[PDB]
Amino acid sequence: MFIEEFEIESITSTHLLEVLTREYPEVRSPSIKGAMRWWFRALAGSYFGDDAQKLKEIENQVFGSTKERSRVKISVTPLSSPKRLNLKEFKDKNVGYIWFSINLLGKRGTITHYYPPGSRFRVVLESPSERVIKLATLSLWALVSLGSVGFRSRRGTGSMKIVRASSEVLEDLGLTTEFNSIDEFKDSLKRVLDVTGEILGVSLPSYATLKFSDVEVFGPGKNTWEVLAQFNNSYKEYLRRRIKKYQRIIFGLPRFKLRGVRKDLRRASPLWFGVVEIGGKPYGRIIKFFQSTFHPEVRSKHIVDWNVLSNFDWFISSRLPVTKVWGGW
Numbered sequence: 001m002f003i004e005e006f007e008i009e010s011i012t013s014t015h016l017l018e019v020l021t022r023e024y025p026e027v028r029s030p031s032i033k034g035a036m037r038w039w040f041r042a043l044a045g046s047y048f049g050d051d052a053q054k055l056k057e058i059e060n061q062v063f064g065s066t067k068e069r070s071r072v073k074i075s076v077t078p079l080s081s082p083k084r085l086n087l088k089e090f091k092d093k094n095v096g097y098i099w100f101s102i103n104l105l106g107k108r109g110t111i112t113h114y115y116p117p118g119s120r121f122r123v124v125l126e127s128p129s130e131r132v133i134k135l136a137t138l139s140l141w142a143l144v145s146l147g148s149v150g151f152r153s154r155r156g157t158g159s160m161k162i163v164r165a166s167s168e169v170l171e172d173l174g175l176t177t178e179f180n181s182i183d184e185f186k187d188s189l190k191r192v193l194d195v196t197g198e199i200l201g202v203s204l205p206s207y208a209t210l211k212f213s214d215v216e217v218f219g220p221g222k223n224t225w226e227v228l229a230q231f232n233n234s235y236k237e238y239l240r241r242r243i244k245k246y247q248r249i250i251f252g253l254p255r256f257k258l259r260g261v262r263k264d265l266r267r268a269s270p271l272w273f274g275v276v277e278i279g280g281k282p283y284g285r286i287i288k289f290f291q292s293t294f295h296p297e298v299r300s301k302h303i304v305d306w307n308v309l310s311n312f313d314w315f316i317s318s319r320l321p322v323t324k325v326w327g328g329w
Contacts, residue, residue, distance in 0.1 A: 001126070001128065002126065002127050002128070002129070002130060002133040002168075003124070003125070003126050003133075004124070004125040004126075004133060004136070004137050004165075004166070004167050004168070004169055005122070005123075005124050005125075005165060005166045005167070006122070006123040006124070006125075006140065006162055006164075006165045006167070007079070007120055007121070007122055007123075007162070007163050007164045007165065008120070008121050008123060008144060008160045008161065008162055008163065009118060009119065009120045009121075009160065009161055009162075009163045010115055010116070010117050010118065010119040010120075010158065010159070010160060011117060011159040011160060011161055011224055011274075011275050011277060011282070012117060012148075012156055012157055012158065012159045012224060012228065012274065012275050013099075013102075013114055013115070013116055013117065013157055013158075014114065014115035014116075014119055014149065014150050014157060014158045015029065015102060015111070015114050015115070015150040015151040015152065015157055015158065016029055016031070016115065016149070016150050016151075017029040017111065017150065017151045018031060020105075020110065020111075020151075026101070026301065026305060027101075027105075027151055028151065029149075029150050029151045030148075030149050030150065030153060030158075031076075031149065032074075032076045032121065032123060032140075032143070032149055033074050033076065035143045035147055035148075035149050036063075036074065036136070036139040036140050036143055037059070037063050037139070038143075038147070039139045039140075039142040039143050039146075039147055040059060040062065040063070040135060040136075040138075040139040041055060041059060041207070041208075042142070042208055042209050042210045042213075043135075043138060043139065043142060043192070043193075043196045043209075043210050044058060044059070044135075044196065044200060045205055045207055045208075045209040046193065046196070046197075046205075046209040046210050046211035046212070047196070047197050047200060047202065047211075048205075049203055049204075049205045050203065050205065050206075052206070052207070058200070062132055062135055062136065071127055071128070071129055071132045072125060072126065072127040072129075072132050072133065072136045073125070073126040073127065074123070074124070074125055074136070075122075075123070075124040075125075075126075076121060076122070076123050076124075077121070077122045078115070078119070078120075078121050078122075079120040079121060079122055080115060080118070080119040080120050080121075082113035082114060082115060083113060083114065083115070083116050084112065084113060085106055085111065085112060085113060085114050087103070087106050087107065090102075090103045093225050093228065093229065094228075094229040094232050094233070095156075095225075095228055095229065095232050096232065097232050097235050097236045097239060097304075098152075098155045098156055098228070098231055098232045098235050099152055099155065099156070099157065100304055101151070101152060101304075101305065102151065102152060102157070117224060120163065123140065125137060125140070131199055133169060134169050134172075134173075134195075134199055135196070135199060137167060137169040137170060138169075138173075138192055138195070138196055141170065141175065141192065142192065142210065143160070144160045144161065144162055145185075145188070145189075145276070146210075146215060146285070146287055147272075147274075148160065148272075148274045153272075153274070154270075154272040154273070154274075154307075154308070155231075155235075155272075155273065155308065156228050156231055156273055156274050156275065157274075158274070159274035159275040159276070159285075161178070161277050162177040162178060164177075165177050173191065173192075173195050174191060175188055175191060175192070176188065178277070179276070179277065179278045179279070180278070180279055181278065181279060182217065182278060182323055182325065185217075185276075185278065185325050186325055186326065189210070189215070189325065189326045192210070193210060193211060204290070204291060204292050205291055205292065206291055206292035206293045207291055207293065208270070208289040208291055209289075209291070209328075210328075211328055212289075212290045212291065212328040212329070213287055213288060213289050213290065213326065213328045214286075214287065214288040214290075214324070214326065214327055214328055214329055215285070215286070215287050215288075215324075215325040215326040216285075216286045216287075216288075216313070216322050216323065216324055216325060217276060217278070217283040217284060217285055217286070217322070217323050217325055218230075218283060218284045218286075218316060218317075218320055218321065218322045218323070219278075219281065219282060219283035219284055220278070220279075220281035220282055220283055221281075221282050221283070221284075223282060224275055224282045226282075227275055227282050227283065227284045228275070230284060230316070230319075230320070231273055231284060231316075234312070234315040234316050234319065235308070235312070235315070237315055238308070238312050238315045239303070239304065242303060242306070243303055246298070246303065250298075267294055268297065268309040268310045268311050269288050269289055269290050269291070269295070269309065269310045270288070270289045270295060270307060270308075270309065270310070271286060271287070271288050271289075271307075271308050271309055271310050271312050271313070272286070272287045272289075272308075273285060273286045273287075273308070284316070286313065286316065286322075288310045288313070290328060290329055295307070297309055
């Protein structure tokens with residue numbers, strides 16, 4: 001009867017909007033359970049690579065499926081009450097471009113409440129298996145360290161930290177529940193990678209993995225909002241040039257593209273950002289995922305909703321010092 005308990009807290013505004021996803025598919029809102037499942041695949045996938053079948057076998061074996069029962073029980077209860085949304089916040093805090101979509105739902109009255117910074121959630125993990133509970137906790141560790149939850153969580157919302165926990169698994173693996181330095185961050189990623197392989201037994205994959213990714217930070221800032229504001233200024237200019245670029249490419253004068261001198265030269269990769277706390281201070285966190293599957297920069301929706309890609313890093317790194325935390329490339 002293994003058991004792991006956590007209290008996590010929102011660092012940035014959190015928007016749990018799974019309800020809206022049925023009518024509006026753009027409104028994707030990863031839950032804690034869902035994001036843990038996602039991050040398990042990124043960890044385990046680092047070792048299975050090509051063998052996508054074997055990955056799905058273990059994933060179902062841990063988290064359950066339609067024909068299966070989960071070997072772990074995950075319980076998530078919010079400890080805070082949702083608070084009233086102030087629409088003045090977007091102009092005031094300089095977050096109006098990265099969180100444009102939230103601002104629009106706000107005005108349309110589609111959402112009225114959210115979970116502000118300081119919102120707390122209890123996460124409890126239970127399993128009969130030691131192998132399973134270790135993998136579950138590693139997943140959650142990864143979700144807090146590199147991920148986030150909710151609507152627009154790839155763009156700074158739903159960044160989390162662990163305020164308190166009782167975890168024999170993290171104790172066993174020599175991991176922490178907070179980062180006191182960037183070096184602790186660097187070392188933990190190596191540890192999480194190294195351990196995950198052992199628990200499972202033991203050529204670029206076609207899906208996102210931890211192993212083949214880049215993690216970077218910048219800061220510290222005065223406060224969280226200042227960090228978010230930096231992302232917003234950068235993204236505004238990124239989007240400005242993006243609009244001009246694709247007006248040319250798609251609707252301008254027809255030109256023949258030239259083949260890259262390097263294979264997959266114009267195949268840029270997904271980029272997520274959010275806020276990580278290091279030494280009690282807020283840092284901007286960026287993660288870039290490199291895999292085999294091609295992901296279009298072009299989507300049949302408004303360009304403001306287009307994914308942020310890895311060529312966005314210039315608009316951060318040209319303006320302030322960036323530290324590499326993990327180099328999969």
